[PDB]
Amino acid sequence: IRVFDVWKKYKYYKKPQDRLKEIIFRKPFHEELWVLKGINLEIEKGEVLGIVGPNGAGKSTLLKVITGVTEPDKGFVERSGKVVGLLELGTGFNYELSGLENIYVNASLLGLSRREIDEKLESIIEFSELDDFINKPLKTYSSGMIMRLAFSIAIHTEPECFIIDEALAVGDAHFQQKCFRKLKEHKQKGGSIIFVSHDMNAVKILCDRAILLHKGEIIEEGSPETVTQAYYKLKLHHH
Template sequence: MISVKNISKTFKLYQSPSDRLKEIILHRSYHRVFQALNNVSFEVKQGETLGIIGENGAGKSTILKILTGILMPDRGSVNIDGKITGLLELGTGFNAEFSGLDNIFHNATYLGLSRNDIEKKLDEIIEFTELHEFINEPIKTYSSGMVMRLAFSVAIHADPNAFVVDEALSVGDAYFQQKCMQKIKAFKNNGGSIIFVSHDSNAVKILCDEAILLEGGNVVQQADPETIINTYNFLIAKRSKGEDIRYQGDDTSSGYGNYMVRIDDVSLQDENNNPSEILISGRPAKIVIRLAGEETIDDLTVGIGIRDKFGQDIYGTNSFHLKKKICIKKGQILLIEYYFKEFNVGPGKYTVSVALHTGDTHVNECFHWLDKSVAFEVVAGGDDIFIGFVRLKPDFHIKSETGNKDD
């Protein structure tokens, strides 16, 4: 288990290196104090994953450096049952002049493995990296993705009880990222505790049991991952346009914006244009959004996002990307319809979120964002049975080796 209680960390920031020397000699202050963390507390139990999100400078990396012993907190306590390793800033603990093989021995030693332990795990570490032909080359010749492979493999094979992952994982190719995610899930299933820092909202929703939102070194909120991601989106919108953004929420849905245009209602209609919370995969369907203009807006964007039961975004679009211009006058009511000739979504439970803003994203100016505005279920149709999120309709052919079709 990881237990962090009321940790705080400040840094002295100097305009130039010479200011440090002047401060020592003249006994005068030539620095300003930056509060990286302020009374941060959380716990991660055995077999649980905690996500940490926030904008750049919020304090995420500082927490990870304190957890891994690179930094010491000014105040507060950190208790970890067992060994903690992880993937922090790319290349940490590596020597660019050494070969990949030498760096395995050096880095694993820093993580507490004996030489005998390293030799026993060496083949497994190298096999996971898939860098066999490059393992004896100096890592200064490696790409960033190759360095990430090496760093992750060493850290995860060092028998940790807890594991921390920073954005360094994002530099890998899609194949190796999936391989790392599978390894992290297996580590969690075996009782390992994980701290996961990422800007990938879907990854946080899938991997994490709980999440915290940091802003300016403070914990703004601690809750389930989807709630935290929604609040994070709200804070981004608020920062972009100032204090005119207001937050409103309840147990089932949450919304925010300056409400110059308001979402009055969101509903679903089946293939017969009847209101329904049950849709058939592959059949026609509509999402109908009722808008009320509190002010006249000449450049309105209406967007939708569909999420699965885990909060993953499986589909999203908006009128800006569809090149549809929308104007609404003060006091006017508009009905916006998203019509799907074939609603090619896999069977399961979903929610629809709706956003009103200008331009391509809600960061420009957010009028109203409503999460989980309506919930629905998709059931299988009578044909084209499949699993997954997306219903594709491929042409299927059988050919002999001569190239002739047999069907």
């Protein structure tokens, strides 16, 4: 929901041994590099926010500050509810356990109560199309079946916000439409969505507003049309 003047840095070593000299010398041999510099950002209930920018812009660090996987070095972030994205998919999955048991493990870590998972269990199964394999252990699943289960649990956990990472965009045909429908319902109940994409036409189609990120800063905000035109302008002068 609210990102307030957030800065984030990471220690950076010119060669792996400056790490080794740091422990032995007891003095830093690293450079403090800032992936995020004074981010101010609000994601409001009911909106789809597009986030675009080049590879080292800091997008994924911004996603982790938003979700709380990472804490800012300056500033703060506040949120009314849970955020679910790539890095939460399949958390706690155990390949010795059946897909039924992994629903309970994963859904619980993603915030649902035992009663809520009981209430949603058949929906998650039917949505997954795995019904014939739900009592078999994950170690017997194909990779596509494992991904299918992780998506199917996650999309039912009613967070405040879903992050649609740039990698999530690829998926099996017709399963996307089902997820697309769930995501519109989510938005209709006041949920928010963060769409991270390099598809500028998709950003204009799906998002209500967007930001352009570059070298750790938001350099443009507003309508998808405005932010994508600013991205093109940036790529005329960036690399």
